[PDB]
């Protein structure tokens, strides 16, 4: 429904980037939230997807270990954490909604609404 | 030690007497309902097969533990035959099965390809597929480990609180009894018109020695009219013919 | 992950001409593709999902085709505002992308 | 659909039987050979003869059956 | 565990079920009556698959067979080779399976997630010492875990000698899996048998009702091997087939008219599906039919396929414009 994200930040190497996207209405009980990174000069690099309903998170191999995702139980709050921020890992990164689901668990094959993002640097 | 519903346990009760004395009237239970025998008469009967199914489910799932009632817990975890004889017993267990951050020790099968038949206990962990791409043990998209724990919490709504469910399933006297309610014996009376009870097969007639033999597992016989012809005495095992009173 | 290769690295055409963009998998993904349009200053937006099925709010000039491992994005007539970098996405991650430039 | 009648010589004599299908106009949903199609239905498993005799087991519509030399 | 070799590819011959495999359908005494019973029964006069072990050939015959709706199983021997059964679905440790094994120490029944040997076996060794046979091997499964059902009986000091001749002891069993219970019935009779089950009649008494909750679609038999000082010591080829036979049939829904004699033994029965005469006997509740015409059941053509052809409606009903509307 919504992808309300954080502002931009600059921080010390090794620090974690902890931000969340808030989705209201019926998002919590339906659609999941996917985190993707818009590295400069690149295409998008998907990082992971959190499903607060199944208590599960799916991750890109590229971002395993460094990216973990936490979420709340009310407003769907996709609280992504990127550990060990490096200065070379400067990017605009964001959340997007995965608009396909079912009660037969076909779950999320694709995306619909994307949030554009915020910059994290050092 | 209650089981996850996806893998509910079961214990056999045998070679024992009583404790069917409307134990539920202690009012420790949120619900008690029998689908066969009326509860107050359970303690007057003999049974050949008695079992207790033991597991933990959410409050809004309690209603699914019933013959004829469909739903995911009824179809993917624990299933009763519609032709069910027994009693379903349940109570709130927040003091044992709930934790502040959620008690996740109890698993449910949420993802399944087919429904269960009565009393099938499927403890498989095969990843469930829901789409055209195989997703072979990937986790995500079209596939998930079939089981999910539920975080029971002491502060959630009642339908989200844990309940302990025990289903007492049993067979009636169609074989020699092994479990009986409490009974007081009286002596065997031969000849004369006498009102008898044994293990059931209650009736009035004249008991005389029979010239019949029963196979070791039969206990009693039947006439063409489907009335008891003769019975074996639970004590000493003599076969007695039941003739009508004049 | 699901590895995808895109081609050409750069496509060169005039506005009004057809733009064809290729994406190829190392493994079959059935019909699970999405296509996106990237612009300077903007993360790419969704054009297509389900390989050929057009996304909500997207103009009729965009459509896709293909199955298994071989997929195409077609813009029947590329507009001056569509000289974007196009990308494919599999259920999990994105391909390399094709830059489109004016000839 | 229809009724099925079984023509039986007494079992203390023979275990051969013949079967009559009430509404079959042969178009039968079971077997063949020894098929006599009559107004009483299809009689399968009996030999029609051009002789005539006293009636033994009646079938209907002028036809009777019997067990003879077997 | 051990993949056995050196075998003649003896063919899957069939025999006649005749009038065997009726069973006692109840646990109630009846006598000097006829009674109509509905159950899963071995059909009369069916083609029963014959299986056979014989050395001469070096034939050991221990395949995976379908369980379907239940299995009629006969065991023919004097040699005590055929013993034990395996029941389950995939039979590969992925899920639980039921293992029933008769060894000299005891009879063990367990339900576990078992790791299969592919072709498991028991066996005896012929010792030079005392010129006698002794149980030496239990190469039955590689492992088991996650065991939920277990029963163990007393010792069975069975005659382990590799006795030759026609077969003298016949056991008959049925294995059927109903509403969570694995039901086992059996009986023993004397024989003089080589290939064709005697044209006899039997009803067998129940033994157990096992409260397992197990899904069974396939089963495999278990056979013993004979090893000696007259064979190679190699575990895959160093063996003797001895001599044994077994038969496998399947149960089908049937109605039988059963005849209970004085003292309640089922003495005879008629399979109501064999032919029009049997149908007549079942209809009349009699094993004797007088000369004449009887009507039996009826004839009805069954459907072969189905038609839906409903309205070609493609849009969806606007329930969401009613519910969650303001
Ligand atoms: C039993 O196995 C069959 C396949 O052999 C499967 O279709 C069926 O759903 C299984 N039943 C249970 C309870 O797993
Ligand atoms: C038996 O042969 C099969 C062939 O597929 C093989 O996978 C298995 O490991 C072999 N077992 C032993 C004990 O050699
Ligand atoms: C044969 O004799 C040996 C002596 O070492 C003994 O161990 C073995 O148990 C005996 N076998 C039988 C079948 O009695």
Author numbering:
A (entry chain H): 2 to 52, 52A, 53 to 82, 82A, 82B, 82C, 83 to 100, 100A, ...
B (entry chain A): 346 to 591
C (entry chain L): 1 to 103
D (entry chain B): 592 to 617, 634 to 676, 690
E (entry chain B): 15 to 70, 76 to 345
Provide excerpts from the study.
In the SARS-CoV-2-6P-Mut2 + Fab J08 complex, we captured two different poses of Fab J08 through three-dimensional (3D) classification, which we call conformation 1 and conformation. In conformation 1, the J08 Fabs are further apart with a more closed apex (RBD more down), while conformation 2 has the Fabs closer together and a more open apex (RBD slightly open). Superimposition of the S-protein models revealed movement in the S1 subunit, in comparison to minimal movement in the S2 subunit. Both conformations consist of three Fab molecules bound to a single S-protein trimer. Although J08 binds to the same epitope across the different conformations we observed that Fab J08 has the smallest footprint on the RBD in conformation 3 at 658 Å2, followed by conformation 1 at 728 Å2, and conformation 2 at 985 Å2. CDRH2 appears to play an anchoring role and provides the most hydrogen bonds (including salt bridges) between antibody and RBD in conformations 1 and 2. Accordingly, in conformations 1 and 3 and the X-ray structure, the heavy chain interface residues (defined as contributing greater than 5 Å2 BSA) all reside in CDRH2 and CDRH3. K417 is at the interface with J08 in conformations 1 and 3 and the X-ray structure, contributing a hydrogen bond via its side chain amine with CDRH3 in conformations 1 and 3.
The S-protein is a glycosylated, homotrimeric type I transmembrane fusion protein responsible for host cell attachment via its receptor binding domain (RBD) to human angiotensin-converting enzyme 2 (hACE2), a process that is enhanced by a coreceptor, cellular heparan sulfate. The S-protein is made up of the S1 domain (residues 1 to 685) containing the RBD and N-terminal domain (NTD) and the S2 domain (residues 686 to 1213) housing the fusion machinery. Clinical candidate monoclonal antibody J08 binds the severe acute respiratory syndrome coronavirus 2 (SARS-CoV-2) S-protein independent of known escape mutations and is able to potently neutralize most variants of concern (VoCs). A relatively small epitope footprint high on the receptor binding domain (RBD) ridge and the ability to bind multiple conformational states of the S-protein contribute to strong neutralization across several variants.
